[PDB]
Amino acid sequence: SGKLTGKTALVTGSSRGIGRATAIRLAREGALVAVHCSRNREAADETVATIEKEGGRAFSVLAELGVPGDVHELFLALERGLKERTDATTLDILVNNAGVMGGVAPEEVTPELFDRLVAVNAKAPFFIVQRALTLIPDGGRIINISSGLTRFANPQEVAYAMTKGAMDQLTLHFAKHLGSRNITVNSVGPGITNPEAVAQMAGYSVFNRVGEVTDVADVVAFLAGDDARWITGSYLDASGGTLLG
Amino acid sequence: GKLTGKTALVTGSSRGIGRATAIRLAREGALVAVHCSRNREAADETVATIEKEGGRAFSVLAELGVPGDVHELFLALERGLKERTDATTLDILVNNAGVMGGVAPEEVTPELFDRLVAVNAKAPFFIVQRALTLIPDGGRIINISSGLTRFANPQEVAYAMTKGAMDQLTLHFAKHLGSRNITVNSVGPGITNNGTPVFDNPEAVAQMAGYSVFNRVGEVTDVADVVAFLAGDDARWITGSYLDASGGTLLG
Amino acid sequence: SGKLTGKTALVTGSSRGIGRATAIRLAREGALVAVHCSRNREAADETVATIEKEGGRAFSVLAELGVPGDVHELFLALERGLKERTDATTLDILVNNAGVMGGVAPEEVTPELFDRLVAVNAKAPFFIVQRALTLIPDGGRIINISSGLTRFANPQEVAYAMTKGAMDQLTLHFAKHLGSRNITVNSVGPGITNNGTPVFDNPEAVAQMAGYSVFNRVGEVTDVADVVAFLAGDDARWITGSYLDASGGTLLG
Amino acid sequence: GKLTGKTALVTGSSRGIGRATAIRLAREGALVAVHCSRNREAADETVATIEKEGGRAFSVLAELGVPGDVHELFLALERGLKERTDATTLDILVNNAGVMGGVAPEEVTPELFDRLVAVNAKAPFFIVQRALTLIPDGGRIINISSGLTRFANPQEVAYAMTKGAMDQLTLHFAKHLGSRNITVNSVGPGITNNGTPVFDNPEAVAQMAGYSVFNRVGEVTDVADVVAFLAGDDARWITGSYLDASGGTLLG
Ligand SMILES: NC(=O)c1ccc[n+]([C@@H]2O[C@H](COP(=O)([O-])OP(=O)(O)OC[C@H]3O[C@@H](n4cnc5c(N)ncnc54)[C@H](OP(=O)(O)O)[C@@H]3O)[C@@H](O)[C@H]2O)c1
């Protein structure tokens, strides 16, 4: 039971971190959750187990994002697992969460690394959305997990932030596009998300603590439900006040 | 009831977004102080409505924008809370009350300006300042702003100015109350059907609907439900922010 | 230069700091400038003298802002001064620069001080714009000096930030309002700026203010003045309703 | 002229905004590298116009968004720079080159996507990376973004994604390059008449004109004159920002 009973959801990159927590949370609201990961079937199944242990419903879906054919593989697996469990291909909630980072100075960024950041973080989300319009009913949900680094300068992750900048444009423009179909499209921006180095990252928030994976997941689940029907095209700041300069 | 055994004050609460906000917060198990400037009866009609759902609420009278406004309000509030809970703890503060100008820029007088500032910006500042002594660590402050802070409309410039002032309150009090774990956030409504004579008129309603990407006017419920979320535990990691409850009016 | 030759301007709070430098840069570009100040007639005459030494044109205007009759006196003096030197009351450029800070913790703010900050920082600029519309021609300019404190949290000056967030709303709605008359309306947001005070004589404090800028220096009054001058000229005809970040990258974090 | 003694590269300066930017920078006395993909005559026409007005410019030819683009661009750039100044100093970099998608969201192919990224966001990044050694302390990077980063338009979502990436390039390199005194800023045009067929129909024009509060479309000089200000000394204290050169298109 819960807000999302009889709803289906897909969360990309949800074997670890925010994705995992988001899947758990959405499942807790009574949603059927496709747990996606790129490479680890094991981690993906740990998540599916937890959801079942806590009385919810989920299934793992493996498909490496960032490579030719990623969208085919994601949906082939996804659409089957859905018809298997509901006899429909409907996808009520899409969470674009998967993302990889750069971790080098701009002078060390290769054309190839740039291509891959774009491919996983921005290109996949675009073509995942495009194909998912097929499955998403009227009144459905799209939620894109952004990054605090889009509002906060960090040259050590410039290529990463560029791709998340790109992802945030999905929110603005698909919100407009999907208006007539009553599908809301929003972004969620985390802060820093989980020694003496702990003490310094905790300083960035006004709450003097580091973010937890739950801190973001709870905002996603709100966006995923009916209480958020009148919010679209917007950016939700789940960073514990990190943007306040 | 996720807000059970919590207390809430919503200013300008006898009608419109305020009404719906009180009703929603009550429905979540919170005892709600329903504030009004003038009509004791209208504020009691809301209290009535809440109790018929198995909720807890009490009316409060205090004309905002005049000398001693804050005093009268917190006098009645502290009284009503003690009588009902043996404490005067205020978990949730919603600054909802506000008035518009409805004249062109060249037609604004000093008296109107002063009046807009007094009700829309001054009162909320001092209601926050006073409420600090009643809000526990982990409490909630929600300021109802306006989409006109992001969408040009000269016909309400002075009103928007007072609301932009309100949002700055949000920014700075959020930083100030971080160590006490109180979130401070603004909710910006779009065009919302309250009950004014413009909404009696279709074609006018048709015009306003088009501002939203969903092709409808907002309902009071649309905004109250966003307020309710910020009031709850799911929004503990959101502070100092502006939530866009306009149905995508800001998209251009 | 002669870019603003034939133009007139008013810069409020123009005897000191950012206001002063703005008045100076406008005059340099060829504008006849009304230097306003609230009380100090001498400091205003000093700016005028400086502008004249450089071969420009300026006059002083006394009018205390934030008290009853402030707009009235300002424009009485403005109009007399403009008519004498040009034969017209045409006001091409209006710069809303004047403002006062609160300098008090959010708990010590009284209803009086709040009124005072509003009256000076929000009320006056609104009514100055309102009254100035009668003098500003099609093609004219309005620049509002805001604050980086609208973008950067600082509870120490919260009431002041509210008045300045009010001021940004002026920019947004009047830009829309004044579109059909081809007047641009923009905001300029300073960061920390060295206004000549003793505070800036201490290097240890200078350094910790400098760190807020990506360039590792404090701003000069001239860094802000030069942006205002750009907005005020023809090259910025296609910018309106916007906010210019003249703070040396303070908002980057 | 403010830019006497300085050099500038403007990518895609053979027509539209790039062309006018090149022309305006040369007018202030800068030596301008005029760039485009293959059309030598197109680049040279801009060079001709600049020379008539008594300025200095040379054409440089490199198709952006293909393996080797950067190498080919800088080889041509330095050659031409050395032939004229006997130095490879680049004072001013303007990332203007850009292409549009122009198909519905459902129609976008991986191929089109890759192409927009490669030209609009990736090339600017690697051009910057490579230019860093030629740009002296106190120099300038100006990135030509788009109002579509703030104004919803599904017909160009992929394009707008690349411009969102572009604005991130501004934010992060502004920080990275601060200790070197290099300002990095975005200029975001609205609808600007660039000679394409759409600006010929006086009906679609009137419609486009209505996006601005001045009720006209932008001209190429409207944007170029903003770039020129950023390229000069008067804008030394602005960095990491977005300049809204749309004539008030983002006001709602
Ligand atoms: N005009 C508008 O409405 C508008 C609005 C917002 C933003 N913008 C932005 O402003 C910039 C220029 O706009 P515009 O309207 O002036 O464009 P334009 O008239 O189409 O000219 C663009 C220039 O970019 C060059 N270019 C395109 N692809 C290239 C490639 N792969 N390699 C090398 N050069 C390339 C073109 O040269 P070749 O022909 O040789 O390729 C051309 O000189 C773009 O970044 C655009 O996104 C324009």
Ligand SMILES: C[C@]1(O)CC(=O)c2c(cc(O)c3c2C(=O)c2cccc(O)c2C3=O)C1
């Ligand atoms: C010139 C054009 O063929 C027409 C067009 O559709 C457009 C194009 C490029 C743009 O950057 C924009 C726009 C735009 O409308 C438009 C409409 C409203 C706001 C905008 O920022 C824009 C644009 O930025 C391609």
